[PDB]
Amino acid sequence: ADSDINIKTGTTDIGSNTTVKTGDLVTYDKENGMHKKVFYSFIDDKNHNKKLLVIRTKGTIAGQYRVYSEEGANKSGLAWPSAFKVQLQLPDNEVAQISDYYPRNSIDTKEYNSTLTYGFNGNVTGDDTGKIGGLIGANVSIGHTLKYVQPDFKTILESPTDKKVGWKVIFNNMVNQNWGPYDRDSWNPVYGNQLFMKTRNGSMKAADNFLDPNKASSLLSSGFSPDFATVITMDRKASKQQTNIDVIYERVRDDYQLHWTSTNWKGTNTKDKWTDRSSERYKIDWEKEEMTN
Amino acid sequence: ADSDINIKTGTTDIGSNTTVKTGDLVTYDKENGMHKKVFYSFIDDKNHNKKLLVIRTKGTIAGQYRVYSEEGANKSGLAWPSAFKVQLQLPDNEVAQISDYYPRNSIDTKEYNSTLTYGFNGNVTGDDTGKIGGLIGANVSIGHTLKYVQPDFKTILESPTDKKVGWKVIFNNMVNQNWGPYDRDSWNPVYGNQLFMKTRNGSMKAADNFLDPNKASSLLSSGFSPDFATVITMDRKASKQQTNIDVIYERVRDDYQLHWTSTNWKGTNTKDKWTDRSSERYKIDWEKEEMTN
Amino acid sequence: ADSDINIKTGTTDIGSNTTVKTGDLVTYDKENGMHKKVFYSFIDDKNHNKKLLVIRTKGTIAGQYRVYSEEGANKSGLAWPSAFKVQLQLPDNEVAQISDYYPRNSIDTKEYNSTLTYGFNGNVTGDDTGKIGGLIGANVSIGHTLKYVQPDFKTILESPTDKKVGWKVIFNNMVNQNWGPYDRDSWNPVYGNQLFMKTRNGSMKAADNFLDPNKASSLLSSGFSPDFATVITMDRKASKQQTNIDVIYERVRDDYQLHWTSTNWKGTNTKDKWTDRSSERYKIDWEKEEMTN
Amino acid sequence: ADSDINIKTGTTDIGSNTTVKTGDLVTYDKENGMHKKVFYSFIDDKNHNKKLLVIRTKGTIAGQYRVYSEEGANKSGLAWPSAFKVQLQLPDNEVAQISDYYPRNSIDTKEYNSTLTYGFNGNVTGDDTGKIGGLIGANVSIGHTLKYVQPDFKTILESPTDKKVGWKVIFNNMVNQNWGPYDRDSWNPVYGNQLFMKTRNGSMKAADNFLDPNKASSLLSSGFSPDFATVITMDRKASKQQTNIDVIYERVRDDYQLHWTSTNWKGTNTKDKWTDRSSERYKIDWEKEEMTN
Amino acid sequence: ADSDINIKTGTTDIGSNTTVKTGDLVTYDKENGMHKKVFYSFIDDKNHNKKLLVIRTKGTIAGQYRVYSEEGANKSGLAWPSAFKVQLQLPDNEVAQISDYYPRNSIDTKEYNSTLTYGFNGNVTGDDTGKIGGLIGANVSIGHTLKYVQPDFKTILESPTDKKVGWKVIFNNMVNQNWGPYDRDSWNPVYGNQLFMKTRNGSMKAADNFLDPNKASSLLSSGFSPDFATVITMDRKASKQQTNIDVIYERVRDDYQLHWTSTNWKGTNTKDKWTDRSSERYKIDWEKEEMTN
Amino acid sequence: ADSDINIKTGTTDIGSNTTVKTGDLVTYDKENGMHKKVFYSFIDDKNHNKKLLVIRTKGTIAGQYRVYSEEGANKSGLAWPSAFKVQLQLPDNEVAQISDYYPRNSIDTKEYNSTLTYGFNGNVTGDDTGKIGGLIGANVSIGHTLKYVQPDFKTILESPTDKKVGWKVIFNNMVNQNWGPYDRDSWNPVYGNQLFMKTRNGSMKAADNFLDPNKASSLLSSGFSPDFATVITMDRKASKQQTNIDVIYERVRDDYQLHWTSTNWKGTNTKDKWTDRSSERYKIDWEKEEMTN
Ligand SMILES: OC[C@H]1O[C@@H]2O[C@H]3[C@H](O)[C@@H](O)[C@@H](O[C@H]4[C@H](O)[C@@H](O)[C@@H](O[C@H]5[C@H](O)[C@@H](O)[C@@H](O[C@H]6[C@H](O)[C@@H](O)[C@@H](O[C@H]7[C@H](O)[C@@H](O)[C@@H](O[C@H]8[C@H](O)[C@@H](O)[C@@H](O[C@H]1[C@H](O)[C@H]2O)O[C@@H]8CO)O[C@@H]7CO)O[C@@H]6CO)O[C@@H]5CO)O[C@@H]4CO)O[C@@H]3CO
């Protein structure tokens, strides 16, 4: 931080004494169930070597967790969001560049606990007949406990370039009615993957044996609201002061199936079964400082 | 945050050098027990590409946790709030759009603790006769603890569009006199769902064997106070500068019933038995910058 | 801090009453998969004995965790990032100096828990044949629990001089599907190093038995985004007011090999097998207060 | 705090309505591997009874943790930093005085847990022959658990006078691959001091059996970056308005030796074997309000 | 807090619209190893009923933990700081008064954990000879855990008057190499007081069996830095506008003696064997707003 | 909070654009060992319906923990502060009123931990003779833990009226050398009340068997510093613009006595044995805006 290097806070930040032009662009993709919103800001700071555009991709991608197929009371399928994605990309011959973005990938940590114990204990025994007994024994215990936090979904910054940047919020793991956690690869020789299995031996129809969406991650059903920012820089002398940028909102769905084995329920999960992609092109005009779609 | 992208804090925010028109609108629905209040704010920032309206839905929906039926003395039913809802909807022909909203769904997390342990120990017997014994043993343990928070109610942002947005505060689970927690599906073969059961074997009538509201989540009785914000954008060039919007407050009630088996109490819960819907039409005038109902 | 020595906050900071000249310079290295971005700030504060240039090295170095080789189906290798580095170097004939930098090395801590516990107990047994027999016993135990946090990667400031400075974010240790944590030297006689081993006895081919990137540190694949700052001072009277500086972005990759032993999977790790070095020269003009490349 | 004594916050602080003159002085000692940087600030506040100079000593002292000796494959020695020092000294004739400094020594704390627990347990036995048995026993136990944090290195303000002040960052203790923690006096009859011992009885050479620096405190190798402030005051009537002051950066290295005993590795540590002392004289001109070396 | 009584924050503080006169006075007492610094501030706020002088007593009192006594290879003495004191005193004739001071005494707390646990447990036996066994027992446990923090030294505000005020930072207790903690009265029938004992029975001179100062509170050695504030009020109409005040920095040292008992080390601690007192008279001129010594 | 009700923060606070008159009044009662200080602030905000006076009662009441009687080595009594009090009272005929005060009584809380655990365990014995048996058992355990903080002294706001308000800082309970905690009612059939007993069976003068004041709450000896505020309102039309108000500082002391039984020490505590009351009248002049005594 500036203070660590003996500099007045904010001194090197950009935007002071600059008339900032902002804008909101909302698009709703009915078929893909995605509310796409771009909030932009043109920052042409004259003490900065380039014009800047801050593009904030927000809105929300519906989870769309749902029973899609019910082919018999013994077999049913559930489609669910295993990944949400937002991507911005500048066409190959664009002189403008991707300069920054937030959030980014943070280093995860884990707490380690190592414990060593050992003790002693005696024991004088006896009975009515008169037998006087005794005992002496030692003991040693060594063990460790590993602690770490696991978000239901991971927010990851995809390897960016000067033309493209993106984030993917992927299903990590989840607790099912206090059990697990389970993930996309969880497997029980008897029950298979119990990720969204409501009951193991219940008697209802397969289509009714899936976990209640309210008892699972809210992102699965109601959806995820992106809140990403990317800064694009542009040379004032660049010959073409108009830039095109394509934005992808995406949802990757897995297929979780339940079938009755005549004795109990067994679940299966198939990865990236479906993919819903909504693309939108925005036009950036660095002279009028406006962004449209 | 702006700091992470080397930009002066608040540089890209909307509002500066703008006269903002605010307003308050209160409506009490007696039949539905809802105090409905709209706090609005027009922000027509000329450096922003569109007119903006921030609508904050507040007030409070009474819980109405009450004993409604009493078929005799050994059976009675309790009406309780399993969900509170607030929705705003723009008629499909409006050019104005829902651009943002808050709160949104946040990713839940859980803490995982893995523990491994190994031990050694010796034992040396004894007794008056002069018999000396021995003992050498080992042990291994591989247990793990899972930790997470469980709010009595979850605040969920429903999948929005550019015309409709809503929230639902749904009952999640609750503690009943230190036991449980219990939820809408809890089931014991003997006592059924004990969600709001005061006693297991009391000799009182059914109507008097429901948990005292003061010992349950206060939202169940006194109520929930929404505090949601919806942002609506409007083209300044739009021919029609008036917009209609409907705001709906709802309460979904479950039916928790108790009956005497002959030896103990047994409860059952019927989901979404009743639904109290309170809708209201508001007029938004982007030119006068006022909202009326 | 200033307040700790009775001095008004901010009093000794640099930057006040100074027009700061900032700039952004972006470079993408396709071959090495590195998005390199320099954010600089020239601070020529006249109450300071020197001109300053704050150089923030950001961008993102792709992790590139991937299977690079596979011989048959029982042998395969995985290239992964064990180190990410950023270095700045001023030529020996330069009069400009490296004055500060951030972050720096933090002093690690650990928590200690010492446990001592005494205990005694009485006992009395008996049978139908009226046999009375008591038991008196005692016990002690010394325990020690050690606690500390372990980041997946450590961020380290390398020993700087007045002409060179660098940082290295190195792989420390990582949790593999709840087990471990494992590091570059972990070794088990039967399984070898299980760092990125998916299964111990799986029947799939080697290339398919590597931990899924989504289930490992996000730096390994998507990558690491540097956020380091370098401060360079320049004498206003130096004959030469132009400085060249070389910035280097690197990725050191280890080679994690898996092979079937006819009975189970066994892995090995080879350190620093590959090094991707991306260097670029920038020109610093202290007079025009601009940096170019 | 000032609010505790009903005084407007910052009212007694120094620096308002004063032009502060600052400066940076960087020196790199190659022989001792020390990047030395002085950041000074002259505050001649006229409502203060004396002139003020704040000298911040920063830069970085390399750790220099390295294998220095190799006599065969059974013996080897490691040089490592047990202390990093920074000292400032005014020659005794100077009228100027050291008035303040930061950081200082803080009172350390510890947590105490007393656990008294009572216990009662009975029993009933009955073999398949009609024989009955009983058991009644009690138990008591008093446990104590001590908790406190131990930084790898302690940052200490040495006893100052009005002519000299200094800090010493000394090696405290450190975890070795989850064991320990070990310190400079750690001793085991078998392995001796295992402080930096990689393996107890590995087959490699002595020079290859030292802990990976990356697995040890980063200060040991990469180095320590001082961040100390010294405040010096000066009478305005002082006849002589120039002051000399020496600044010494120091590193004390221990000698850690490992030798093969023919059955297992044994470690030995020799304290303060080497001292690297880098001294430099600066000139303080209270009139020109500048510092020079 | 002002906001708690509906008053704008700071509305009540003293000092606004007032030119404050500050000063620094440094005195080094070599024989007593005390860096004594007074930082004062005169606040003559015309809207306040009296003149204010805020005296801050800082600097640092050297710890001086040392093996000063050596009476052969079986006897040695360590002199250590059991208390540090700072006192300010106005003569009985003075009209100026002590009005406020900081820090003050804070109410300590303790955490209480009351645990009650009980349980049952079945058990069936059976040898390959047809003999079946049974077992049924229960248990009850009642135990409490007391938790609290123990600073090495306690900072205490002595009972002030309108003429004198003072502080004392007294040794509380301390952890000795993972054991204890020990205080000034710790007594063991075999080892006596092990406060600063390094080994129970190591074979070395008595002068070498004392705890390394680096392994004990740094206040014992390097020293304590007072940071106490005293506010003295003066009536603007008082005949004499000059006040004398005596400031005393003091150190009380205990004597920790070690001696071999033919088999082990035994320790004793003598309280307040030495009291190092450093007093200095200062002159306060309320008309000139100057403090001198 | 103002923000919670959509109002600009601080918008409703009192004191803006108002000249505030403040003052200090110091009184030392040697007989009662009480430093009494009043810090007042007249706030006559013309946009507020009444004149306002903020009276801050501070200073400090000496604890006075002391051995007062010694009737032979087997008997001795200790006087200690079981309560400290501060009260302000306006004679009944005053039109001025006590409007607010701080601190107030806050709702205490506790943490509840209910643990449910059940398990199974198999076994198989054996003897070189050829016998092969086994033991199968189960177990259950319901245990709960209660957590809460217990300050040594409780700061309580006494029931106020519009003519009188007061606080009491009463002794709650205290840890005695890691045992207890003890309070005024603690009673042991063998030792009686051990609140301040140094040793249970110590062979020394009774007057020397009281706990060292440094090992007990510092309020007991050095004392408590009141830091209370009282706001008084006054009608501007009131015909009499002078108000009298008495401030009482008080200390209540218990009597803790230790007598040798013959085999051990036994303590006894007599509640509210003594009461030291220091009263003083102040004159409030709402026109001159000053407080005098
Ligand atoms: O009996 C003394 C103890 O009693 C009280 O504790 C009760 C507690 O307040 C209740 O909430 C409940 O606890 C349950 C807990 O809430 C559950 O989460 C679970 O616990 C698991 C842990 O979550 C999990 O991480 C792992 O735990 C391991 C630790 O992570 C690891 O650090 C180590 O623990 C050692 C401690 O580090 C060390 O300090 C020392 O602990 C002593 C305490 O510091 C001391 O205060 C006192 O504890 C009181 C406690 O304060 C009361 O509130 O004595 C302790 C001595 O043991 O030693 C620890 C042991 O080595 O190891 C642990 C175990 O591997 O696993 C656990 C489950 O095993 O379950 C809990 C039910 O036990 O009940 C407790 C007890 O009544």
The full DSSP string for E76-112 is EEEEEEEEEEEEEE--TT---EEEEEES-----EEEE
How far apart CA E190 and CA F74 sit, in angstroms, is: 29
Per the listing, tokens 């917009």 go with: B243
Instruction: Give the type of residue at E71.
Output: E
Per the listing, tokens 């002294």 go with: F153
How far apart CA B44 and CA B288 sit, in angstroms, is: 11
**Cα distances (Å, whole numbers) of residue C142 to C116, D201, D264:** 5, 28, 27
Give C216 to chain D, closest Cα distance, Å. Answer: 20
Q: Which of F100, A174, F28, C106 is nearest to D223 (CA)?
A: C106
Question: Residues near D157 by Cβ (< 8 Å), separated by ≥ 6?
Answer: D101, D103, D104, D105, D165, D166, D167, E60, E218, E222, E223, E225
* Ligand 1 proximity of E115 Cβ (cutoff 6 Å): yes
Contact criterion met (CB < 8 Å) for A112 and D56 = no
State whether residue F126 sits within 8 Å of chain E by CB: no
**Which protein residue's CA is at the shortest distance from atom 50 of ligand 1?**
E145
How far apart CA A243 and CA A55 sit, in angstroms, is: 13
Q: Which of E265, E271, E274, E276 is nearest to E76 (CA)?
A: E265
Question: Residues near E143 by Cβ (< 8 Å), separated by ≥ 6?
Answer: D115, D116, D117, D118, E115
Resolution of the coordinates, Å: 2.3
For residue A253, the CA-to-ligand 1 centroid distance in Å is: 41
Q: Quote the tokens at residue D238.
A: 């002082």
Q: Which residue from C minimizes the CA distance to E37? A: C5
Q: Which residue from E minimizes the CA distance to C142? A: E179
How far apart CA D79 and CA D66 sit, in angstroms, is: 5
Report the sign of the C-alpha dihedral through residues D123, D126, D130, D131, in that order. negative
What does the angle CA F101 – CA F105 – CA F109 come to, to the nearest 5 degrees?
A: 155
Which residues face F251 on adjacent strands?
F84, F276
* Ligand 1 proximity of A113 Cβ (cutoff 6 Å): yes
Rg (CA), chain D: 29
Burial class (CB in 10 A: 0-12, 13-18, 19+), B189: exposed
How far apart CA F97 and CA F161 sit, in angstroms, is: 9
Q: Which of E224, E214, E152 is nearest to E183 (CA)?
A: E152
Question: Residues near E161 by Cβ (< 8 Å), separated by ≥ 6?
Answer: E98, F28, F30, F35
Contact criterion met (CB < 8 Å) for F54 and E7 = yes
Q: Which of A215, A171, A169, A218 is nearest to A196 (CA)?
A: A215
**Which of the 8 DSSP states describes residue F213?**
G
Verify cis geometry, omega within 30 degrees of 0, for the bond prior to D226: no
Q: Which residue from C minimizes the CA distance to B112? A: C178
Q: Which of E12, A4, B250 is nearest to F19 (CA)?
A: E12
Which residues face F37 on adjacent strands?
F26, F58
**Region class of F33: left (phi > 0), else alpha (psi between -120 and 50), else beta:** left
Instruction: Give the type of residue at E148.
Output: Y
For residue C25, the CA-to-ligand 1 centroid distance in Å is: 53
Q: Which of B274, B186, B289, B286 is nearest to B242 (CA)?
A: B286
How far apart CA E28 and CA C161 sit, in angstroms, is: 37
For residue D118, the CA-to-ligand 1 centroid distance in Å is: 17
Instruction: Give the type of residue at A20.
Output: V
How far apart CA A226 and CA A247 sit, in angstroms, is: 13
- Give helix then strand counts, H and E, for chain C: 0, 16
CA torsion, ordered F9, F13, F16, F20, to nearest 10 deg: -140
DSSP E188-224: BTTTB--TTB--SS-SS-GGG-BPPGGGS-HHHHT-B
How far apart CA F149 and CA F135 sit, in angstroms, is: 45
DSSP E134-185: EEEEEEEEEEEEEEEEEESEEEEEE---SSEEEEEEEE--EEETTEEEE-TT
How far apart CA F201 and CA F221 sit, in angstroms, is: 25
How far apart CA E293 and CA E287 sit, in angstroms, is: 17
How far apart CA E136 and CA E123 sit, in angstroms, is: 6
* Ligand 1 proximity of F214 Cβ (cutoff 6 Å): no
Strands C242-260 and C265-285: antiparallel
For residue C148, the CA-to-ligand 1 centroid distance in Å is: 17
How far apart CA C7 and CA D16 sit, in angstroms, is: 9
How far apart CA E30 and CA D159 sit, in angstroms, is: 11
How far apart CA C31 and CA C276 sit, in angstroms, is: 9
Q: What are phi and psi of F94, to 5 degrees?
A: -70, 140
Helices marked H in A45-162: none
How many Cα atoms are found within 13 Å in the side-chain-facing hemisphere of F52? 27
Among D145, D147, D149, residue to substitute to test ligand 1 (most atoms within 8 Å of Cβ): D145
Verify cis geometry, omega within 30 degrees of 0, for the bond prior to E181: yes
DSSP D156-195: EE----SSEEEEEEEE--EEETTEEEE-TT--BTTTB--T
Q: Which of D24, D33, D136 sits opposite C159 (nearest CB)?
A: D33
Helices marked H in chain F: 218-221
Q: Which of E290, E287, E162 is nearest to E236 (CA)?
A: E287
How many Cα atoms are found within 13 Å in the side-chain-facing hemisphere of C227? 16
How far apart CA D268 and CA D255 sit, in angstroms, is: 8
Helix (H) or strand (E) holding A219: helix A218-221
Q: What are phi and psi of E214, to 5 degrees?
A: -70, -15
How far apart CA C205 and CA C221 sit, in angstroms, is: 21
Q: Which residue from E minimizes the CA distance to D45? A: E22
How far apart CA C42 and CA C70 sit, in angstroms, is: 51
Strands B174-176 and F111-121: unpaired
Structure determined by: X-ray
State whether residue F125 sits within 8 Å of chain B by CB: no
Q: Where are the domains of chain B?
A: 1-293
For chain B, how long is the longest CA-to-CA vector? 110
Contact criterion met (CB < 8 Å) for C112 and E56 = no
**Which of the 8 DSSP states describes residue C152?**
S
CA torsion, ordered D33, D39, D40, D41, to nearest 10 deg: -170
Q: Is D215 helix (H, G, I), strand (E, B) or coil?
A: helix
Strands F290-292 and C133-149: unpaired
Contact criterion met (CB < 8 Å) for F178 and D144 = yes
Q: Which of E56, A134, A82, E222 is nearest to D7 (CA)?
A: E56
Report the sign of the C-alpha dihedral through residues F175, F180, F185, F187, in that order. negative
How far apart CA B225 and CA F123 sit, in angstroms, is: 57
Q: Which of B217, D7, D280 is nearest to E53 (CA)?
A: D7
Question: E-strand spans in A90-214?
Answer: 97-102, 111-126, 132-133, 136-151, 153-158, 164-171, 174-176, 179-182
State whether residue C145 sits within 8 Å of chain E by CB: no
Q: Which of D58, D33, B168, F8 is nearest to C158 (CA)?
A: D33
How far apart CA F42 and CA F236 sit, in angstroms, is: 13
Among A115, A116, A117, residue to substitute to test ligand 1 (most atoms within 8 Å of Cβ): A115
How far apart CA E116 and CA E136 sit, in angstroms, is: 21
Q: Which of B169, B154, B285, B142 is nearest to B226 (CA)?
A: B169
Per-residue H/E/C for F179-208:
EEEECCCCCECCCECCCCECCCCCCCCHHH
How far apart CA F141 and CA E120 sit, in angstroms, is: 7
Q: Which of E64, E106, E94 is nearest to E223 (CA)?
A: E64
Question: Residues near C76 by Cβ (< 8 Å), separated by ≥ 6?
Answer: C67, C69, C70, C205, C206, C207, C209, C210, C257, C258, C259
Q: What are phi and psi of B207, to 5 degrees?
A: -55, -25
Instruction: Give the type of residue at E288.
Output: K
Burial class (CB in 10 A: 0-12, 13-18, 19+), B111: middle
Interface present between C and D (3 or more CB pairs within 8 Å): yes
Q: Scan residues 7-66 of A and list those with Cβ closer than 8 Å to D.
A: none
How many Cα atoms are found within 13 Å in the side-chain-facing hemisphere of F208? 7
How far apart CA B60 and CA C24 sit, in angstroms, is: 50
Question: E-strand spans in chain D?
Answer: 21-29, 34-43, 51-57, 60-61, 66-71, 75-89, 97-102, 109-121, 124-126, 132-151, 153-157, 164-171, 174-176, 179-182, 228-234, 242-260, 265-285, 290-292
Question: E-strand spans in C90-235?
Answer: 97-102, 109-127, 133-149, 153-158, 164-171, 174-176, 179-182, 228-234
Strands B75-89 and B242-260: antiparallel
CA torsion, ordered C186, C189, C194, C199, to nearest 10 deg: -170
How many Cα atoms are found within 13 Å in the side-chain-facing hemisphere of B125? 11
Burial class (CB in 10 A: 0-12, 13-18, 19+), B37: middle
How far apart CA B223 and CA B153 sit, in angstroms, is: 12
Burial E257-280 (b: 16+ CB within 10 A, else e): bbbbeeeebbbebeeeeeebebeb
Residues in chain B within 8 Å Cβ distance of F114: 178-179
Question: Residues near A176 by Cβ (< 8 Å), separated by ≥ 6?
Answer: A182, A194, A195, A196, A197, A211, A216
How far apart CA E249 and CA E88 sit, in angstroms, is: 9
State the closest ligand 1 atom to the C-alpha of A147, by its place in the atom list counted from 1: 25
Contact criterion met (CB < 8 Å) for F39 and D6 = yes
DSSP chain B: -GGGGTB-TTTT-S-TT-PPEEEEEEEEETTTTEEEEEEEEEE--TTBSSEEEEEEEEEEE----EEEE-SSSSEEEEEEEEEEEEEEE--TT-S-EEEEEES-----EEEEEEEEEEEEEEEE--BTT-----EEEEEEEEEEEEE----SEEEEE----SSEEEEEEEE--EEETTEEEE-TT--BTTTB--TTBS-SS--S-GGG-B--GGGS-HHHHT-B---EEEEEEE-TT-S--EEEEEEEEEEEEEEEEEEE-SSSEEEEEEEEEEEEEEEEEEEEETTTTEEE-
For residue A112, the CA-to-ligand 1 centroid distance in Å is: 15
How many Cα atoms are found within 13 Å in the side-chain-facing hemisphere of B273? 15
Verify cis geometry, omega within 30 degrees of 0, for the bond prior to A226: no
Contact predicate F26/E99, CB 8 Å = yes
Q: Quote the tokens at residue F230.
A: 């009282």
Q: What are phi and psi of E271, to 5 degrees?
A: -80, 135
Q: Which residue from F minimizes the CA distance to D145? A: F178
**Which of the 8 DSSP states describes residue F217?**
-
Where does C1-293 sit in CATH, by number?
Answer: 2.70.240.10
How far apart CA C90 and CA C92 sit, in angstroms, is: 6
Question: Residues near F130 by Cβ (< 8 Å), separated by ≥ 6?
Answer: none
Q: What are phi and psi of F4, to 5 degrees?
A: -70, -20
**Which of the 8 DSSP states describes residue C273?**
E
**Which protein residue's CA is at the shortest distance from atom 63 of ligand 1?**
A145
> How many contacts (CB atoms, under 8 Å) link D and E?
213
Contact criterion met (CB < 8 Å) for E105 and F222 = yes
Q: Quote the tokens at residue D220.
A: 């040991």
Question: Residues near D237 by Cβ (< 8 Å), separated by ≥ 6?
Answer: none
Contact predicate B188/B194, CB 8 Å = yes
How many Cα atoms are found within 13 Å in the side-chain-facing hemisphere of A275? 8
Interface present between B and F (3 or more CB pairs within 8 Å): yes
What are the CB-based long-range contacts (under 8 Å, 24+) for C74-77? C74/C205, C74/C206, C74/C259, C74/C260, C75/C206, C75/C257, C75/C258, C75/C259, C75/C260, C76/C205, C76/C206, C76/C207, C76/C209, C76/C210, C76/C257, C76/C258, C76/C259, C77/C255, C77/C256, C77/C257, C77/C258
Q: Quote the tokens at residue E260.
A: 């071999």
What does the angle CA A221 – CA A225 – CA A226 come to, to the nearest 5 degrees?
A: 135
Contact predicate D98/D90, CB 8 Å = yes
**Which protein residue's CA is at the shortest distance from atom 21 of ligand 1?**
B145
Contact criterion met (CB < 8 Å) for D39 and A112 = no
Contact predicate F174/F154, CB 8 Å = no
**Which of the 8 DSSP states describes residue D137?**
E
How far apart CA A36 and CA A60 sit, in angstroms, is: 7
DSSP A233-246: EE-TT-S--EEEEE
How far apart CA C42 and CA C284 sit, in angstroms, is: 10
Report the sign of the C-alpha dihedral through residues D261, D267, D272, D274, in that order. positive
Report the sign of the C-alpha dihedral through residues B280, B284, B289, B293, in that order. negative
Q: Beta-carbon neighbour count of residue B19 at 10 Å?
A: 8
